[PDB]
Design a protein around this ligand. Structure first.
Ligand SMILES: [Pt+2]
Ligand SMILES: [Pt+2]
Ligand SMILES: [Pt+2]
Ligand SMILES: [Pt+2]
Ligand SMILES: [Pt+2]
Ligand SMILES: [Pt+2]
Ligand SMILES: [Pt+2]
Ligand SMILES: [Pt+2]
Lengths: 164, 164
């Protein structure tokens, strides 16, 4: 967790000054701003040692955790509904879930085969979608006009489950 | 707009069949699914010609339009409040706006100097922020525990206005 070699000098200096005596983890941390100021430039790499921030990660972050979301110019809701309601394309998996679950109803389209972001944007634009979310596993999720937000964080598209 | 050389053959073939006779732009487009099926693989690059999708872009998309958003593991709201309420760091610009404006109140932090995404994530994590949004102009916006969503789409951080 703590990087002792980098941080021991300055961290001790703050401790001697008696800063960073307050734990954020339970209750208010009155001293947190003062502790950050005393650490200065080393706060990012040494806040773990004083307990003010989480230890340097013990875990490997899944690629799916990142996603990049953009809102398409000039959405065409009628096209999106027309291509969604009817017998959906096999390459397309269609999910409708109640709107604001991710935080009437929100409908999204999950492309099957994994695709590049630029392709994902083009395909959503051709679909009339209001917005698209591109998972960094490369799964593509067009977002419908109804949806308030960017839709489900889940990588629900078949034939690209990588990251699970 | 329309790519005549690529699309003229197939597009004419659909037109002769009398598909793509319905405009999505005003009113329902009954034929939209049939038109897409007739186009098949060329729908993405030729839907403009039949009017079912917007013409290939006349405009250069600003870099700021893309952003990538991730939610930090183990957020520490007390730290975020402690470092936000008090005399804010000069490198940090602090904006509080009513929650759900982007779609009680949502508070976000806009880093001044433009930074890489990995740095932006580390700095937000040290800040206790629930989530971070990284603009592709490279402006970094940590997102507070209060905020329902990912916060303002605006690139409001000083000393990285590139893309405006
Ligand atoms: Pt700091
Ligand atoms: Pt429902
Ligand atoms: Pt399947
Ligand atoms: Pt799966
Ligand atoms: Pt299609
Ligand atoms: Pt307010
Ligand atoms: Pt400024
Ligand atoms: Pt500006």
């Amino acid at each position: 967790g703590c990087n002792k070699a980098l941080c021991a000098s300055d961290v001790s200096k703050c401790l001697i000054q008696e800063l960073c005596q307050c734990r954020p983890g339970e209750g208010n941390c009155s001293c947190c701003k003062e502790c950050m100021l005393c650490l200065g430039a080393l706060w990012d790499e040494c806040c773990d040692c004083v307990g003010m921030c989480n230890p340097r990660n013990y875990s490997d972050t899944p690629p799916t955790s990142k996603s990049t979301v953009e809102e398409l110019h000039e959405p065409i809701p009628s096209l999106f509904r027309a291509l969604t309601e009817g017998d959906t394309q096999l390459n397309w998996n269609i999910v409708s879930f109640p709107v604001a679950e991710e935080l009437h109803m929100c409908t999204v389209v999950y492309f099957d085969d994994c695709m590049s972001i630029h392709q994902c944007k083009i395909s959503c634009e051709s679909m009339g979608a209001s917005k698209y979310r591109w998972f960094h596993n490369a799964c593509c999720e067009c977002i419908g006009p109804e949806c308030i937000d960017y839709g489900s964080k889940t990588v629900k598209c078949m034939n690209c489950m990588f990251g699970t």
